[PDB]
Amino acid sequence: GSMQYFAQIVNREENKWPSEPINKYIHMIWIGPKNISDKNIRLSLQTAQKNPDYSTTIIYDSGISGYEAARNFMSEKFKASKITLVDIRNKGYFHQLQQEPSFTYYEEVIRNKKFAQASDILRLLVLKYEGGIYKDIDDIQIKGFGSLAFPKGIGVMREYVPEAGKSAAFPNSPIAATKNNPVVNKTLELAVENYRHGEKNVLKLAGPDVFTKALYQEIPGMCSQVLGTQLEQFELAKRQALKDEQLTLQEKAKISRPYKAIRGLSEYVCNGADHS
Ligand SMILES: O=c1ccn([C@@H]2O[C@H](COP(=O)(O)OP(=O)(O)O)[C@@H](O)[C@H]2O)c(=O)[nH]1
Ligand SMILES: [Mn+2]
Ligand code: NA
Ligand code: NA
């Protein structure tokens, strides 16, 4: 055994996944016939104003009854801002997006006027085809994102146990992603299965619990328990090197680095889940 070798494989682990740059697009969704709220207009203007280096868009859908009046209302409220409104059906890639099995279910869900539920599918499809940052219309921009880059090209906020929930879930807003990101693709694959199975449980469709399952499948160490087992494997390697044998704070920080970095949207957006 060699402590020189050990220090080197700890250094290697820290740097295993180079940070991948995120496209400077902020995607938000306001689909359906309802007038966007005064609060969500203010939060949207604030999102765009804090991010002058980003193109901020609100996506609507001309395939939904009553879309025109809702689109017109938004056009008037955002006329002074750099926010642009875009029809999902106008996207250059819509011909391919329309053929996605998940888009079949998006169409079924918007027909039943479940727009929040439909947004869980649509946010993933937009990230798949464009990359950038998806944010809920009702999420608070704390400060500008600036130039972001994430290990495995995926950025999320910290997990927590949601209201009346059992297990910790990563929120599915905001999400930063490289185009065609494996985590986004896995979430869509799990969602298509849940919908094909005729799932009625709203926690088992395309929401935070499904996003969390996708993140754990693609990046196992995102689970605090699995990272624990990885740290224990390095502790064993340190014992082998020295055969004082416990991992230092610095060693644990190095081994955990990319998993902490993936939670890097935590400081930029507040979803109000932590409000009194
Ligand atoms: O009529 C509606 C209702 C919701 N949404 C979108 O769906 C997102 C998710 O819904 P919501 O924020 O209500 O979900 P939660 O914050 O409870 O997860 C919203 O932020 C909007 O971006 C929409 O486009 N039209
Ligand atoms: Mn929300
Ligand atoms: Na499932
Ligand atoms: Na190891």
Instruction: Give the method of determination.
Output: X-ray
Amino acid (1-letter code) at residue 2: S
What is the CB < 6 Å shell around ligand 1?
28-32, 34, 115-116, 119, 136-138
Q: Which residue has the tokens 């998006």?
A: 106
Question: Residue 151, CB half-sphere, CA atoms under 13 Å: how many?
Answer: 19
Q: Candidates 64, 115, 121, 203: which one to mutate for ligand 1, based on the most atoms within 8 Å of Cβ?
A: 115
Q: What is the dihedral of CA 265, 142, 273, 229, to 10 degrees?
A: 20
Ligand 4 center from residue 213 Cα (angstroms): 24
Q: What ligand has the least distance to the C-alpha of 195?
A: 3
Q: What distance in Å separates the CA atoms of residue 50 and residue 43, rounded to the nearest whole number?
A: 11
Tokens representing 125 are 């499809």
Q: What distance in Å separates the CA atoms of residue 26 and residue 219, rounded to the nearest whole number?
A: 24
Is 147 within a domain? yes
Q: Do 63 and 103 meet the contact criterion of CB atoms below 8 Å apart?
A: no
The radius of gyration of the chain's CA atoms, rounded to the nearest angstrom, is 21
Is 4 within a domain? no
Is 35 within a domain? yes
The secondary structure of the chain, three-state, reads CCHHHHHHHHHHHHCCCCEEECCCEEEEECCCCCCCCHHHHHHHHHHHHCCCCCEEEEEECCCCCCHHHHHHHHHHHCCCCCCEEEEHHHCCCHHHHHCCHHHHHHHHHHHCCCHHHHHHHHHHHHHHHHCEEECCCCCEECCCCCCCEEECCEECCCCECCCCCCCCECCCCCEEECCCCHHHHHHHHHHHHHHHCCCCCHHHCCCHHHHHHHHHHHCHHHCHHHHHHHHHHHHHHHHHHHCCCCCCHHHHHHHHHHHHHHCHHHHCEECCCCCC
Which atom of ligand 1 sits closest to the CA of residue 138? 20
Q: What ligand has the least distance to the C-alpha of 196?
A: 3
Is 230 within a domain? no
Residue-level length of the chain: 276
Amino acid (1-letter code) at residue 243: K
Could you tell me the residue range of the domain that residue 146 belongs to? 19-221+257-269
Q: Which residues, listed in sequence order, are joined to residue 269 by a DSSP beta bridge? A: 141
Taking alpha carbons only, the member of 260, 271, 272, 254 closest to residue 12 is 254
Q: Candidates 27, 29, 114, 209: which one to mutate for ligand 1, based on the most atoms within 8 Å of Cβ?
A: 29
Is 237 within a domain? no
The residue contributing the CA closest to ligand 1 atom 2 is 115
Which atom of ligand 1 sits closest to the CA of residue 31? 24
Is 235 within a domain? no
Burial zone of 63 (CB within 10 Å; 0-12 exposed, 13-18 middle, 19+ buried): middle
Q: What distance in Å separates the CA atoms of residue 86 and residue 229, rounded to the nearest whole number?
A: 46
Q: How many domains does the chain have?
A: 1
Taking alpha carbons only, the member of 123, 143, 274 closest to residue 211 is 123
CATH of the domain at 135: 3.90.550.20
Taking alpha carbons only, the member of 234, 213, 228 closest to residue 259 is 228
The span from the first CA to the last CA of the chain, in angstroms, equals: 53
Is 246 within a domain? no
Is 247 within a domain? no
Q: What ligand has the least distance to the C-alpha of 233?
A: 4
